[PDB]
Paper text:
Group 2 consist of proteins containing only a [name] domain; group 3 proteins are capable of binding different ligands, such as phosphatidyl choline (STARD2/PCTP) and ceramides (STARD11); group 4 proteins (DLC, or deleted in cancerous liver cells) are frequently de-regulated in cancer and contain Rho-GTPase activating domains; group 5 proteins contain two thioesterase domains; and group 6 consists of only STARD9, a 4614-residue protein with unknown function, that contains a kinesin motor domain at its N-terminus. Of particular interest in the scope of this paper are [name] and STARD14, the family members for which the ligands are not known. [name] Arg974/STARD14 Arg449144 is highly conserved and is likely a key residue binding negatively charged lipids such as phosphatidylcholine and fatty acids. Based on our structural analysis we propose charged lipids as ligands for [name] and fatty acids as ligands for STARD14. All structures reported are relevant to disease. They are down- ([name]) or up-regulated (STARD5) in cancers, mutations in them result in metabolic disorders (STARD1) or they are linked to obesity (STARD14;).
Residue numbers in the entry: 908 to 1104
Amino acid sequence: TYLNHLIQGLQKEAKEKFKGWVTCSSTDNTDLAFKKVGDGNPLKLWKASVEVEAPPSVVLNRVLRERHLWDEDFVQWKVVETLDRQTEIYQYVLNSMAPHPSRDFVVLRTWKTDLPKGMCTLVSLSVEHEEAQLLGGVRAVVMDSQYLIEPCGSGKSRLTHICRIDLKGHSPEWYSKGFGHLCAAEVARIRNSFQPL
């Protein structure tokens, strides 16, 4: 047959050259984008944004201690160990939509509220703990996860989540674009949970 799609070849060629953020279409007023790390790992690094009607340190507490207020799937949670005033081992479970197993998490988080220019950050990465035993389905691997919250406007914040998770056992042809949408919706829910509703 005759149909040259060297086009789809030429895009895949220019993306390989590029090492920064590739933007996406995103619903419900969010900014999505991705990035190939050049890792030797197919998994993309994603970056979602929103403007949220609350000052940074509030938004930070909303992500850090109040996620039952914005995630209907967020089920079992416990601080597993406290390492210092601002770092800990946290363990939660997320329930899954279809008859799948649950995605499970055990993470080192540290957070920071006294950064220059009113900035706050929460950062996470998966670990194992001698006391955090499979609370259900499938251990994920938070390879990267970082919330950057910065002041924009009068008592409002720009919330940005850059992450890269390896849930263990779905298609690479699913984390190609579908995962990004899940990120943009997490960050939209956080926003919604500060709207009189």
